[PDB]
Design a protein around this ligand. Structure first.
Ligand code: ZN
Ligand code: ZN
Lengths: 243, 243
């Protein structure tokens, strides 16, 4: 009964993508059902069961190439299983069968693929990496032209729960003063719209086509895990790959 | 104008309580008339006005101490504004003037107080915190004995609309098989009686005096906001305090 989100976009013929929810797994509170993360304290066998179940649900051709997400802006081109460091917050693939995966629980998941369906990419974009331009570095790994790139914004904490400090807002404006529209005042802090921020950097890059960005990990607690909300909790993941 | 629900129970001397409804406000759809929630996308000034009307109608001594409800089971004791964190789903107070409040739109609201009139508490009981035991934790905050504690169940999504998966039912039965009675199958799901579950947990702790729990936020769409019913909508709240 694993419920799986399918990105609403003109998915190209040779591309398959899926994003998970906290439902249909086997873990117990505070990671109650489909927790894919192996680093939040959950029962290690349950995490294996959840992964085994989601891979089947998603018809993944092979195991996802999990990164060592350090909230930076480095993109790891999945050229071949023999890697040095998997340390990074994005992956790019031009290889059929290889699975791009990003692990999240509030941070912005973003999936990319060219219209021809010959190259994909997955990104975990927290504010720091977002601000440092992880989306720009990902896009630049694409041989194709921005014009031909599709971007899907996965479930993340929305503009009603993503409360951030004044530095975060000033951090963004100090790169593209137009980020001012993504912040609304809420006391000595602001309510940021990570989707709006992504769209801006994406536009700056040329990517005219963007979908998703209509969910909230924090608010829809019955569907997603949320680090901001629960502190100790499970993890969801977004996957893309060339068939 | 600001129709205010008054708990039907043996209200003690120095205690006052009220619970709001969607009527008598200033908001427009999908939050038409008295929305109290400031984080559901409503017009803040309207929310600002809806709150001022209620506080007057309710004749509250001060502004309510809004919590950061995360659907957990943490209870916050209101002894001094400088608080480490506001993250909680229940509040307790033995200080006059202090207003305990919980914001809802389906989840179970519960107000507490002792027969003496020296202790009060409010609880936002989502199904997880209810299961994880937020009512027991709230009670164990009272210096008085359960025998003397009065409990009121405010409007929540009733037993004819609160549909849940096998997980919910199982989670509850895990804690106490007796919880099987609050569930009645509907297709591949069940119909839960949140009030029934509250009463059981309340009884396990010796709370002999329980009132209310005859409403349904979902069904009575002309009186309450419903999260299950409307996806985007306002919020009601329940208030209690020592005069
Ligand atoms: Zn993150
Ligand atoms: Zn709730």
């Amino acid at each position: 009964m694993s419920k799986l989100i399918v990105p609403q976009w003109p998915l190209p013929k040779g591309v398959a993508a899926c994003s998970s929810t906290r439902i249909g797994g086997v873990s117990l509170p505070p990671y109650d059902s489909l927790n894919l993360g192996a680093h939040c304290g959950d029962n290690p066998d349950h995490v294996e069961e959840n992964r085994k179940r989601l891979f089947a649900a998603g018809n993944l051709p092979s195991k996802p190439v999990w990164l060592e997400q350090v909230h930076g802006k480095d993109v790891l081109k999945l050229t071949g299983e023999p890697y040095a460091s998997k340390r990074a917050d994005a992956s790019y693939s031009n290889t059929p069968g290889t699975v791009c995966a990003v692990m999240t629980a509030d941070c912005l998941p973003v999936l990319f693929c060219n219209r021809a369906g010959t190259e994909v990419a997955a990104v975990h974009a927290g504010w720091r990496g977002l601000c440092a331009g992880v989306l720009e570095e990902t896009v630049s790994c694409f041989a194709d032209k921005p014009e031909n790139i599709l971007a899907w914004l996965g479930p993340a904490i929305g503009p009603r729960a993503f409360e951030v400090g004044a530095e975060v807002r000033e951090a963004f404006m100090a790169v593209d003063a137009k980020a001012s529209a993504a912040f609304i005042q809420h006391g000595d802090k602001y309510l940021a719209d990570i989707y709006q921020l992504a769209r801006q950097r994406l536009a700056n890059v040329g990517v005219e086509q963007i979908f998703g960005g209509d969910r909230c990990t924090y608010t829809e607690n019955e569907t997603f895990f949320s680090y901001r909300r629960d502190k100790t909790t499970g993890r969801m993941a977004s996957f893309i790959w060339l068939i």
